Design a protein around this ligand. Structure first.
Ligand code: CZA
Ligand code: MG
Ligand code: NA
Length: 980
């Protein structure tokens, strides 16, 4: 049944044709079970590290290396009757590299624990129904509940399905809807229809929502919807939105990988358009692929990311997904939940007042303030910002007495967590904490164990008066009371009191006196007017507190005369009251939240509050934390979920750009707001702690959960602030930007090597030259000998002005303009210095001089034309030395390039090459690995190399060194005649 909240109880009963007193027949159940299915959310699996690996080869860049590996495997099989001992190394290294990258890519996006499994934790396994075949309440599996049957819920129950309330059997039914609202405050349900067909969960006080729980009361209802058609079902559908997405940097990478693939298959149409019977293509096409691809990038990327995570862990931020450690770096909008995120989610009494003195039209109040933002009994009472003893004011003694006695909650020290927690409602525990701070009888608490300290002062008060019974809360009275007698008195004794608490208006009207110290005087208009004026100010400004009036009936009726089983009589028992005091409470901001907001603003980041709580307290908090100015007007800048649902699509979309405060919202509203923000192509984050935050946390580019929040929120996030420090979000942005800067410079360095290896192989094929470099070599170059210095570049002490500019545009490309022209040209000098030396050992070299008129081009004719312009041998092109001189030049050039990459524009004259010790130590590790291929006996075979002379290396150290000057020329023109 749709819109059950908008219908009446009989209308709902009619709709399914059941009686409140027999329920469905097993016939009706079978039919409904068939038509609607079972009462449960479908599980979401999460794929396996098989088809996750399969999805690794799913992109074009590695689709190239897999195709190439097969062609390389064909080349390794059809080997001549020569070096067949280890010619398969080429294809088998590539194939290992692919699987090695495949495993590295999956592992960084970790965590097998499911968000939906955590969500089904809110499904009860058992439910309670009245069905036709039995008189007594049946207890069946919750998954067998069907729309239409009569369900019963009571104290401590998880609600089994979305239910329309039929009759409430207690004086009140109190509900905890925090999974839909993020607020623990118990909600007071009724049975009257809620006409508005677009009412929001908070407005549907005649409904029970599945997965929520019963704080107090007993109720009977009819099931409206089950399974996936519930409010928690909506949350679930948005968790299954596994529409495979990636971070803004990964997309830039994927796009860069797609631009790089349209280079390889563009040089193949270039190579082909220069000229069995074609083994020359499938030999050099493989060399083109291996060359262009900077394989090992993942390794050096992963590492950069890995050290960011590990660095972030020391700041108490746990990054559940490696790439996300950078995301906040380029975030323009941070959406944030309020309760438990921006605030502590610990209701606190921050102000209170009693009457000072009364005189005709003059009335003055003793106002006090109370510090402490937690449930811990630590804090102090101040008058005019100076400390006082609460026990000196008799009115505060009664204030505490009322708060301690008119209370069904208490405080508990959790020894495993080392913190104080509530037991019962937050608003009542605030009263418990208040009473322990006040300590109005000067009980000695300094030396109590923390567990005894929790309720010490409340216990003292409980020793003085015996609570005989509570006139529980009722809707028509908006207040509650407790009937108490002086302990150590007889049933008959006078001195009984009623202690009342409730909504200021109603309570105050039922007062005929005001307490002054231990005296009492008539309530008058001027006195009432004074009281009401401060209650009004306290609950509307930037205070906007929640105020309770506290009163006592000095002469309550005799127990006997009071009829307890009839609550409509409770109001009149609570009359002829004496006003005592007011308390004002709010759930307070975390102390570091304000600072964090300002620093984000300074980094050009927007902060938006999206909360299930109410607009008035949403706005007040926004002012406290700096999202709004204290006096700034916000009519068009703050909205409720329902106001938002009234705006047409375009207006809603614009609202997300204009507004900063969204209140009384539903889980879907949060993801909708994030969705809109993303339609302006803004990189947006979400911060939260509740189940109601999950949808939004998932849809964001990065979801950030609070350490002390819910498991659902945590499993939907990529980052958890274990200690609940909002400051860490600022530090996260800094680290995130440092990461992007690192990648920006080590991609330049590696691709520089890559473009050089491409041009080299484009010349040893268009100039018909002898094989300059081989695939087998390049794989060791790009993964091991180039990877190390690239990984060493990540040990850069970050820029000191990285947090002062705004976030980079999403459309801003990794490398473009001058940087392309830069590495593109360096990739040309390398592509000609490796070709040069490989040809130079064949000409101007004494250890094998060929025809020095460029007649090296013809290697086509060895035994084919030996009587031609020859002079000597045949097996001299496949010599190790040309490849050795080509390799050693490639390697040595990049070692300078590594020293060149220490700065983007500052010269090595102005920035010493001994800044990074990890880089220098990496060049040694590169060298001692490069010379390890030469001297170590079994290695020089596969990589076909041989060590050189003192002069041989001196020609290397003369064709590589003048790369510094080439880059220096690019540095001068950039820093001067370009910009700056
Ligand atoms: C099998 C496997 O998991 C993978 C790989 O083995 N890789 C990456 C890759 O995803 C490849 C890649 C995708 N997009 C880009 C952009 C830039 C560079 C690269 C890539 C290198 C590719 C490689 C080989 C590192
Ligand atoms: Mg919250
Ligand atoms: Na996401």
């Amino acid at each position: 049944m749709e819109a059950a909240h908008s219908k009446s109880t009989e209308e709902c009963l009619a709709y399914f044709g059941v009686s409140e007193t027999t329920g469905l027949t097993p016939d009706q159940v079978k039919r409904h079970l068939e038509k609607y299915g079972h009462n449960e959310l479908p599980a979401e699996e999460g794929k396996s590290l098989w088809e996750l690996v399969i999805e690794q080869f799913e992109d074009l860049l590695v689709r190239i290396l897999l195709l190439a590996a097969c062609i390389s495997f064909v080349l390794a099989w059809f080997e001549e009757g020569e070096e067949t001992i280890t010619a398969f190394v080429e294809p088998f290294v590539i194939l290992l590299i692919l699987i090695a990258n495949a495993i590295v890519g999956v592992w960084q996006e970790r965590n097998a624990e499911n968000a939906i499994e955590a969500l089904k934790e809110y499904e009860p396994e058992m439910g309670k129904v009245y069905r036709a075949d039995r008189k007594s309440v049946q207890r069946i599996k919750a998954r067998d509940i069907v729309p239409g049957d009569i369900v019963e819920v009571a104290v401590g129950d998880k609600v089994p399905a979305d239910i329309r309330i039929l009759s409430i059997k207690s004086t009140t039914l109190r509900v905890d809807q925090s999974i839909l609202t993020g607020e623990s405050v118990s909600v007071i349900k009724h049975t009257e229809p809620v006409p508005d067909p677009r009412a929001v969960n908070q407005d549907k006080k005649n409904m029970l929502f599945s997965g929520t729980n019963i704080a107090a009361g007993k109720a009977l209802g009819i099931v409206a919807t089950t399974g996936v058609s519930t409010e928690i079902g909506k949350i679930r559908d948005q968790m299954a939105a596994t529409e495979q997405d990636k971070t803004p940097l990964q997309q830039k990478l994927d796009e860069f990988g797609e631009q790089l693939s349209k280079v390889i298959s563009l040089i193949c149409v270039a190579v082909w358009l220069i000229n069995r019977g074609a083994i020359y293509y499938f030999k050099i096409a493989v060399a083109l692929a291996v060359a262009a691809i900077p394989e090992g990038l993942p390794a050096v990327i992963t590492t950069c990311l890995a050290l960011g995570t590990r660095r972030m862990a020391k700041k108490n931020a746990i990054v559940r997904s490696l790439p996300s450690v950078e995301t906040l770096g380029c975030t323009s909008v941070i959406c944030s939940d309020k309760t438990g995120t921006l605030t502590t989610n610990q209701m606190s009494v921050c102000k209170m007042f009693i009457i000072d003195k009364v005189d005709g039209d003059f009335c003055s109040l003793n106002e006090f303030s109370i510090t402490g933002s937690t449930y811990a009994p630590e804090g102090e009472v101040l008058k005019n910002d100076k400390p006082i003893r609460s026990g000196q004011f008799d009115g505060l003694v009664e204030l505490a007495t009322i708060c301690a006695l008119c209370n069904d909650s208490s405080l508990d020290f959790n020894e495993t967590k080392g913190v104080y927690e509530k037991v019962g409602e937050a608003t009542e525990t605030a009263l418990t904490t208040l009473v322990e701070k006040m300590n109005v009888f000067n009980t000695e608490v300094r030396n109590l164990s923390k567990v005894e300290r929790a309720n010490a002062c409340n216990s003292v008060i409980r020793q003085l008066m015996k609570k005989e019974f509570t006139l529980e809360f009722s809707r028509d009275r908006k207040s509650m009371s407790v009937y108490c007698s002086p302990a150590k008195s007889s049933r008959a004794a006078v001195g009984n009191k009623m202690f009342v608490k409730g909504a200021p208006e109603g309570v105050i009207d039922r007062c005929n006196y005001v307490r002054v110290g231990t005296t009492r005087v008539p309530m008058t208009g001027p006195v009432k007017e004074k009281i009401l004026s401060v209650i009004k100010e306290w609950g509307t400004g930037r205070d906007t507190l929640r105020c309770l009036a506290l009163a006592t009936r000095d002469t309550p009726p005799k127990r006997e005369e009071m009829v307890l089983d009839d609550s409509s009589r409770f109001m009149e028992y609570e009359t002829d009251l004496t006003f005592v005091g007011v308390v004002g409470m709010l759930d307070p901001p975390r102390k570091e939240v304000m600072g964090s907001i300002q620093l984000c603003r300074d980094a050009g980041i927007r902060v938006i509050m999206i909360t299930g709580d109410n607009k008035g307290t949403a706005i007040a908090i926004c002012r406290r934390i700096g999202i709004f100015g204290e006096n700034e007007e916000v009519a068009d800048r703050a909205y409720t979920g329902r106001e938002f649902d009234d705006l047409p699509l375009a207006e809603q979309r614009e609202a997300c750009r204009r507004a900063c405060c969204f209140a009384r919202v539903e889980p879907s509203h949060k993801s909708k707001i994030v969705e809109y923000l993303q339609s302006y192509d803004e990189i947006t984050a979400m911060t939260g702690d509740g189940v109601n935050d999950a949808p939004a946390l998932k849809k964001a580019e990065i979801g950030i959960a609070m350490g002390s929040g819910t498991a659902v929120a945590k499993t939907a996030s990529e980052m958890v602030l274990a200690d609940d420090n909002f400051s860490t979000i600022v530090a996260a942005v800094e680290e995130g930007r440092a990461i992007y800067n690192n990648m920006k410079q080590f991609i330049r360095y590696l691709i520089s090597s890559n473009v050089g290896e491409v041009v080299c192989i484009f010349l040893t094929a268009a100039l018909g030259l002898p094989e300059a470099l081989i695939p087998v070599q390049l794989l060791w170059v790009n993964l091991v000998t180039d990877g190390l210095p690239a990984t060493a570049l990540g040990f850069n002490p970050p820029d000191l002005d990285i947090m002062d500019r705004p976030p980079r545009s999403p459309k801003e490309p990794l490398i473009s303009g001058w940087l392309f022209f830069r590495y593109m040209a360096i990739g040309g000098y390398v592509g000609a210095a490796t070709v040069g030396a490989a040809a130079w050992w064949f000409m101007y070299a004494e250890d094998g001089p060929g025809v020095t008129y460029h007649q090296l081009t013809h290697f086509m004719q060895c035994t084919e034309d030996h009587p031609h312009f020859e002079g000597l041998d045949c097996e001299i092109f496949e010599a190790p030395e040309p490849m050795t001189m080509a390799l050693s030049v490639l390697v040595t050039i990049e070692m300078c390039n590594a020293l060149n990459s220490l700065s983007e524009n500052q010269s090595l004259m102005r920035m010493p090459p001994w800044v990074n010790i990890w880089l220098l130590g990496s060049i040694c590790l590169s060298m001692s690995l490069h010379f390890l291929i030469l001297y170590v006996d079994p290695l020089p075979m596969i990589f076909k190399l041989k060590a050189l002379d003192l002069t041989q290396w001196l020609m290397v150290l003369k064709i590589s060194l003048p790369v510094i000057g080439l880059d220096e020329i690019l540095k001068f023109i950039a820093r001067n005649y370009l910009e700056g």
